[PDB]
Structure 1
């Protein structure tokens, strides 16, 4: 066209690039994080099984109404990740549920991946499907009100099986980069999620080594495909020891080795990191996010994209009952504020421990 250095990806249009940037900043606003309410019909069934409830469209609509219709939730929540159904759903009173987010001033988002499949020639390592027709879905989702997207990839740590294998790392890293660039082209901020699972008895150090390698590879793919980091977000695992590791580390280690590995791999042009919580308890999700943020004023916003970590108690203190909606939202604000405080490094929770004297 205007013969410049032509072996590099082209720039997004001024207009689209600027909109993506603003949404991304808003998503990691001071003291705010993301609510992952994007559970599928099969996933959201299992949550309703705990509380003895049928997985009906009315029950799903009432629960998302419960969540999104909470007053002053937007104080602590910047965006909400939805499953497709919910983006086009209404509550029993007929109100579009996206407008409940609008009214709390919360940005709607949409899970766009089509799930996991095995990579052949690996030992059941996972590839994330979704690229077919994605551009066209994104246009539709933006019209529906969605301003950002989610795509989840899964890597596993199994040292003796060389596992997260090179194939696994680049399938993941490349698919995330394709996804991200299709989103941005069609005006959605991509949340890039390379979840390294915490399964196994590996040390926190091994996790740091792997998480650092994976992330270097992810960002390299991101640059290859021309992804604008300014209009994008990262949803990584925290750096923890594996689930069955006998050496039980502490929240300060989680905080240090997590911050370290991000500092080595994440360029500051990326406006923020929205941590996934994995199988962490609601409380640990907050304690560990706090320990991360006690460790600095960071070059990017270090915040949360929590589902289970924000919803677990809300479901138990609801039981499908329209009576308990008030007390269910009481708890959601509680958890939302708890993690909003962790964002600052000011969530206490509930050494300097001393019995004192006198003079």
Structure 2
């Protein structure tokens, strides 16, 4: 029959955390880059990838001035970032909490190939995820991140890949909720290929419907979850041009057709678009005339950090400049989340 996966106290805690993450005007700073993932970004400058360099970069992202507090409602950290400290000795999770943000952790262990599929992948990281999530909860992490990677090809995504990603996302959500951690479901669809806006919307609707069916099957408390979907955008190789209003219409339409309103908020990911373009698209999404029952916030990795990294240059002299650039971009993204971003 009905066996409660979560007690009312657990549901209340998850709902409170989720609402804190996507409170109005607040979004998510995705600093969840591995040693090899941030290695490419640090190589764009020429600065070597070291523990100290990573620590100082994440301190720069997290120790920004006070005006970034009401704009960032959550920060996703890597495993090593959760255990680093700022210059004054304050741990990074404590730095995030002191600014009013919610500490997040990337719990997925990367994508692995799916046999019999056209390059499709599924995400691993479910081994010992209960103990890992409990430890993260004791270490200050109140929500988790799980990136399930999907792409659009001539025969992709297949039924197997969509069902696999939905199932793994549902299992990760179940484990995180059992451990008191709000799961952020990311059924990311890669904007690779020449697919247009209509096909991206169709694939996003199919993927989100399967994801939420899997969440229902796994008894996931949707009020204690957040969604991190790709913005419904044309492929990078698509020649046809779409305005920001069309992209916003397609994204909001795809969300309204599949995402139940119980989801606390939808935190969009950049997905390879420029900082200004991502902010403008988020603003258009929040300005869409369609009724939006969820908090349409931002969970941006590159759209919040690209110009901050460029300004920093790997040297301590541009610390303040990179702080200022990240702060201004976070303010822009918060305005987009509130729907009044006017560049």
Instruction: Say yes or no: TM over 0.5.
Output: yes
Q: Distance in 1 between matches of 2:61 and 2:270?
A: 19
Which runs of 5 or more residues in structure 2 are unaligned?
none
Q: Does 2:232 correspond to 1:239? A: yes
Q: Does 2:154 correspond to 1:174? A: no
Contact 2:5/2:178 (8 A) holds in 1: no
Matched residue of 2:305: which SS?
helix
Contact 1:58/1:92 (8 A) holds in 2: no
Contact 1:198/1:243 (8 A) holds in 2: yes
Structure 2 equivalent of residue 353 of structure 1: none
Matched residue of 2:216: which SS?
helix
TM-score, normalising length: structure 1? 0.93
Structure 2 equivalent of residue 254 of structure 1: 247
Structure 2 equivalent of residue 53 of structure 1: 47
Structure 1 equivalent of residue 193 of structure 2: 200
Which runs of 5 or more residues in structure 1 are unaligned?
1-5, 350-359
Q: Does 2:217 correspond to 1:224? A: yes
Structure 1 equivalent of residue 18 of structure 2: 24
Structure 2 equivalent of residue 67 of structure 1: 61
Structure 2 equivalent of residue 263 of structure 1: 256
Structure 2 equivalent of residue 326 of structure 1: 320
Q: CA deviation at 1:13?
A: 1.1
Contact 1:9/1:224 (8 A) holds in 2: no
Structure 2 equivalent of residue 77 of structure 1: 72
Q: Does 2:119 correspond to 1:124? A: yes
- RMSD (Å) for aligned C-alpha atoms: 1.1
Q: Distance in 1 between matches of 2:41 and 2:195?
A: 29
1:163-182 alpha-carbon deviations (Å, 9 max, x no partner): 10000010000000000000
- CA, structure 1 residues 125+153, in 2 after alignment: closer, same or farther (shift >3 Å)? same
Q: Distance in 1 between matches of 2:285 and 2:27?
A: 15
Contact 2:114/2:120 (8 A) holds in 1: yes
Q: Distance in 2 between matches of 1:203 and 1:66?
A: 37
- CA, structure 1 residues 9+222, in 2 after alignment: closer, same or farther (shift >3 Å)? farther
Matches within 5 A, 1:104-115: 104-115=99-110
Q: Distance in 1 between matches of 2:89 and 2:293?
A: 43
Q: Does 2:89 correspond to 1:94? A: yes
Q: Distance in 1 between matches of 2:193 and 2:286?
A: 27
Q: Distance in 2 between matches of 1:56 and 1:134?
A: 27
Q: Distance in 1 between matches of 2:42 and 2:5?
A: 45
Structure 1 equivalent of residue 202 of structure 2: 209
Q: Distance in 1 between matches of 2:279 and 2:302?
A: 12
Contact 2:197/2:235 (8 A) holds in 1: yes
Q: Distance in 1 between matches of 2:75 and 2:3?
A: 31
The number of residue pairs the alignment matches comes to: 341
Q: Distance in 2 between matches of 1:197 and 1:178?
A: 22
1:305-351 alpha-carbon deviations (Å, 9 max, x no partner): 001000001011111222211111111110001011111221111xx
1:38-60 alpha-carbon deviations (Å, 9 max, x no partner): 10000111111111111111111
Q: CA deviation at 1:10?
A: 2.6
1:146-166 alpha-carbon deviations (Å, 9 max, x no partner): 0000000011111x3x21000
- CA, structure 1 residues 152+190, in 2 after alignment: closer, same or farther (shift >3 Å)? same
Q: Does 2:32 correspond to 1:38? A: yes
Deviates more, 1:88-97 or 1:303-312: 88-97
